[PDB]
């Protein structure tokens, strides 16, 4: 703690603590060069700028060729991960691909790359194409908007999928040949397990080990993640051999992250918000004089525009010219070409000032435009929601996170910024390629700073949320037919990620059994009981308490196929009726649980009002209710 805070500044509005940049790594190792590779692998790095691998990569690489084993990398994800995955891919290709005969063996190996987001999948795919073009490989996307069919999967070799669509592809019974063919299963951002999509990954993992026992040849599993505690427990979840585990701290990061907080001493929201804006302004003023390109995160998208307006009138009151003093002719040109043409959320004026913003709710084209302009650097300041850290790789020298309380429809309450989101926001930083270090900043209330220091140290385990997704995963598995009884269910649950975590800390995750049942036999079986009661109530699976026999129903099969959540499922069950009509169909569709996170907005409200007058299919609900918004959007 004491080494972390070096220096603290006290200011009238706020008390700011300035953490120094992390330490540079000790060298016990050799930087591994490219000429050490075999013949075909030397084009793995077609542009070899250093001709030597980064501090993280070399050791993990030679270990990766040396062993064929399940591996885990907890790393800054400083662009180091992309190349490592590429290299393991090339190894599998060489194992199925002869060194002498240069014909690539296409039908032997198959590869899967699990990237949480569609956009990041896209980016990855272009990377894999660039690096793998010399072998003559088809690298194509299996997920979502990708829209690959029954055939192209067979044709392709390397796959880049999102977790959801990969889950649904491997869940289906007919394709199992492809699943067996895949030798190489790469999991990017295994730290996702903390978040509620992570349940899908652990379910996929469980299916890989447990579900294919009739062919029974286990594929190579490579986890790739941001640095996280309880790495050992992660390995015990997967298989991981002790040597495959590589834990690298932030000292191995390309640009050391200078951590900074401002505690806010104010309480009432009207002065508190003003104090935050003042602090942000002060930071921006310190940054831009150094020629620093800056990002300011916020909670909500509506917050972005008003924040940028505040920076325009305030920042401009201070000095107008300095933001663009250079190439003002070309800045006027490019700015008018971009802002004036495609933008229509009254965001053009912000672009024109040269403080822009990016958020969900900005047009797809406008969105790409803002990214590009901020890359060129006519945009000095970029106000953003949480989309960028999660999605896009583009780093920016200074990163400010404004505020604590985010509203989550999960609770229906304002919670604190969750650590897993904070960390990935801090990830985008001073550019590893160009700049030397980053500036992280967190605009926050002082009382919660004590919390953010620790959670920002990344001492927090990847929390297992399997409790919510357990039921649906179990149903899908019964549909596969792999579980005929409670004992089978708990054996599958032994390879489940919550199992490990329970073993580590039973009372944290509410194991009553504790001393009893070291293997948590009765705890596992009790969860299965709990699941199969509600499933049976939803007529998803057949179950009997004392006799214990399991079988899958038609509704359960449907939920498995289209990956409907169990809540959505029972909603359909009751709300659909014999006499239900066209009006009620849209209402039920709206009621689908996947829209629970949807809510009506005040900038949306005028267009909603115009719609619902002329809407052909009537709405029983009203403008204030999100369901009505959903089904009118459906009509549109």
Partner 1 sequence: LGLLPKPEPKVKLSNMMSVFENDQNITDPTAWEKVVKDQVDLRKRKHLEENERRHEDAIKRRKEAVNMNVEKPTVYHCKVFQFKNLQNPKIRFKLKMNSKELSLKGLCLRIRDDGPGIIIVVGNEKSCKFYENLVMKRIKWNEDFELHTNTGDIKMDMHNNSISKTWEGYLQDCKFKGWFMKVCNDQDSLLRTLGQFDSEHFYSP
Partner RNA sequence: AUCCUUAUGCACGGGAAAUACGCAUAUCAGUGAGGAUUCGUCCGAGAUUGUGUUUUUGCUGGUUUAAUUAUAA
| Partner whose binding site includes residue 348, from partner 1, RNA, none (CB under 5 to 8 Å by kind) | none
Q: Which of positions 156-195 make contact with RNA (CB under 7 A)?
A: 162, 164-165, 168-169, 172
Segment interacting with partner 1 (CB under 8 A) among 9-17, 186-194, 397-405, 504-512: 9-17
Closer of 377 and 626 to RNA (Cβ):
626
Residue 164: count other Cβ atoms within 10 Å of its Cβ: 17
Instruction: State yes or no: residue 68 binds partner 1 (CB under 8 A).
Output: no
Rg over CA atoms, the chain: 26
Edge-to-edge strand ranges of the sheet holding 71-75: 139-141, 158-161, 110-114, 182-188, 220-226, 71-75, 245-247
| Partner whose binding site includes residue 574, from RNA, partner 1, none (CB under 5 to 8 Å by kind) | none
Q: Give 247's strand partners.
A: 74
Q: According to CB under 7 A, which one of 177, 320, 360, 514 is a site residue for RNA? A: 360
Task: Tell me if residue 283 falls in helix, strand or coil.
Answer: helix
| Partner whose binding site includes residue 169, from RNA, partner 1, none (CB under 5 to 8 Å by kind) | RNA
Instruction: State yes or no: residue 269 binds RNA (CB under 7 A).
Output: no
Instruction: State yes or no: residue 10 binds partner 1 (CB under 8 A).
Output: yes
| Partner whose binding site includes residue 249, from partner 1, RNA, none (CB under 5 to 8 Å by kind) | none
Rounded to whole angstroms, how far apart are CA atoms 97 and 92? 8
Instruction: State yes or no: residue 271 binds partner 1 (CB under 8 A).
Output: no
Rounded to whole angstroms, how far apart are CA atoms 439 and 447? 23
Is 541 buried (19+), middle (13-18) or exposed (0-12) by CB count in 10 A?
Answer: buried
Q: According to CB under 8 A, which one of 1, 2, 3, 12 is a site residue for partner 1? A: 12
Longest Cα–Cα distance of the chain, Å, equals 81
Is 98 buried (19+), middle (13-18) or exposed (0-12) by CB count in 10 A?
Answer: exposed
Q: Fill in the per-residue mask, 472 to 491: x = in contact with RNA (CB under 7 A), - = not in contact.
A: --------------------
Residue 109: count other Cβ atoms within 10 Å of its Cβ: 20
| Minimum gap (Å) between residue 16 Cβ and partner 1 | 9
SS3 percent helix, strand, coil of the chain, rounded to 5, is: 45, 15, 40
Angle between helices 269-288 and 301-318 (to 10 degrees): 60
Closer of 214 and 602 to RNA (Cβ):
602
What six digits make up the tokens of 406? 């985010």
Q: According to CB under 8 A, which one of 100, 103, 267, 364 is a site residue for partner 1? A: 267
Q: Which residue has the tokens 């299963």?
A: 185
531 is in an annotated binding site: no
Identify whether the C-beta of residue 85 lies closer than 8 Å to the C-beta of residue 238: no
165 is in an annotated binding site: no
Q: According to CB under 7 A, which one of 325, 602, 622, 636 is a site residue for RNA? A: 602
Instruction: State yes or no: residue 614 binds partner 1 (CB under 8 A).
Output: no
Instruction: State yes or no: residue 266 binds RNA (CB under 7 A).
Output: yes
Instruction: State yes or no: residue 601 binds RNA (CB under 7 A).
Output: yes
| Minimum gap (Å) between residue 12 Cβ and partner 1 | 5
79 is in an annotated binding site: yes
160 membership: H or E segment, kind and range:
strand 158-161
Rounded to whole angstroms, how far apart are CA atoms 79 and 433? 10
Is 374 buried (19+), middle (13-18) or exposed (0-12) by CB count in 10 A?
Answer: buried
215 is in an annotated binding site: no
| Partner whose binding site includes residue 11, from partner 1, RNA, none (CB under 5 to 8 Å by kind) | partner 1
Give residues in contact with partner 1 (CB under 8 A). 9-12, 15, 265, 267
Give residues in contact with RNA (CB under 7 A). 117-119, 143-147, 149-150, 162, 164-165, 168-169, 172, 197, 266-268, 271, 299-302, 359-361, 385-387, 390-391, 406-410, 421, 561-563, 594, 597, 599, 601-602
């Amino acid at each position: 703690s004491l080494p972390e805070g070096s220096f603290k500044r006290v200011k009238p509005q706020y008390d700011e603590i300035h953490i120094p940049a992390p330490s540079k790594p000790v060298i016990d190792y050799e930087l591994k060069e490219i000429t050490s590779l075999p013949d075909w692998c030397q084009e793995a790095f077609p542009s070899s700028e250093t001709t030597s691998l980064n501090p993280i990569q070399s050791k993990v690489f030679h270990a990766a060729f040396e062993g064929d084993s399940n591996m885990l990398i907890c790393a800054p994800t400083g662009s180091g991960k992309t190349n490592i995955a590429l290299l393991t891919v090339l190894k599998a290709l060489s194992h199925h691909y002869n060194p002498k005969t240069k014909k690539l063996n296409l039908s032997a190996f198959k590869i899967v790359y699990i990237a949480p987001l569609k956009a990041l999948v896209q980016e990855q795919v272009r990377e894999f194409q660039r690096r793998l073009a010399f072998l003559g490989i088809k690298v194509a996307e299996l997920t979502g908007d990708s829209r690959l069919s029954r055939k192209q999967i067979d044709e392709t070799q390397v796959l880049v999928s999102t977790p959801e669509k990969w889950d649904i592809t491997t869940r289906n019974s007919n394709n199992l040949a492809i699943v067996e063919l895949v030798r190489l299963l790469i999991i990017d951002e295994i730290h996702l397990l903390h978040d509620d999509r992570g349940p899908v990954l652990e379910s996929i993992v469980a299916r890989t080990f447990w579900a294919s026992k009739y062919g029974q040849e286990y594929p190579r599993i490579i986890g790739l993640s941001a640095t996280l505690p309880n790495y050992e427990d992660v390995g015990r979840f997967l298989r991981v051999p002790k040597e495959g585990l590589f834990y690298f701290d932030s000292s191995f990061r390309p640009c050391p992250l200078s951590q900074q907080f401002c505690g806010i001493k104010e309480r009432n929201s009207l002065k508190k918000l003003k104090a935050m804006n003042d602090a942000c302004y002060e930071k921006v003023l310190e940054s831009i004089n150094e020629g620093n390109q800056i990002i300011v995160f916020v909670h909500s998208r509506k917050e972005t525009s008003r924040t940028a307006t505040w920076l325009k009138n305030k920042f401009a009151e201070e000095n107008i010219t300095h933001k663009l003093t250079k190439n003002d002719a070309g800045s006027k040109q490019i700015l008018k070409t971009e802002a004036a043409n495609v933008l229509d959320p009254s965001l053009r004026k912000l672009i024109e000032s040269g403080i822009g913003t990016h958020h969900a709710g900005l047009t797809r084209s406008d969105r790409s435009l803002s990214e590009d302009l901020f890359a060129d650097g006519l945009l000095q300041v970029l106000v953003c929601t949480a989309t960028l850290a999660w999605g896009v790789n583009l780093p920016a020298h200074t990163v400010i996170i404004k505020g604590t309380d985010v509203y989550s429809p999960e609770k229906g309450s304002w919670e604190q910024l969750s650590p897993q989101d904070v960390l990935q926001m801090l990830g985008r930083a001073g550019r590893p390629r160009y700049d030397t270090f980053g500036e992280g900043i967190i605009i926050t209330d002082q009382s919660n700073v004590q919390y953010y220091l620790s959670v920002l140290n990344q001492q927090l385990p990847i929390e297992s949320q399997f409790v919510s997704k357990l039921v649906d995963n179990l149903n899908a598995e019964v549909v596969a037919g792999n579980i005929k009884c409670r004992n089978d269910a708990v054996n599958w649950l032994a390879y489940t990620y919550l199992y490990v975590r329970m073993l580590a800390s039973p009372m944290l995750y509410k194991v009553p059994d504790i001393s009893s049942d070291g293997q948590l036999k009765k705890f596992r079986e009790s969860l299965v009981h709990s699941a199969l009661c509600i499933l049976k109530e939803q007529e998803l699976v057949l179950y009997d308490a004392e006799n214990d026999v399991i079988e899958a129903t038609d509704l359960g099969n449907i939920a498995s196929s289209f990956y409907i959540n169990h809540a959505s499922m029972d909603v359909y069950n009751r709300e659909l009726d014999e006499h239900t009509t066209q009006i009620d169909l849209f209402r039920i569709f709206s009621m689908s649980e996947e829209f629970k996170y949807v809510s009506v907005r005040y900038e949306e409200k005028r267009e909603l009002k115009q719609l619902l007058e002329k809407a052909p299919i009537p709405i029983r609900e009203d403008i204030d209710d999100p369901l009505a918004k959903v089904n009118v959007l459906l009509q549109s």
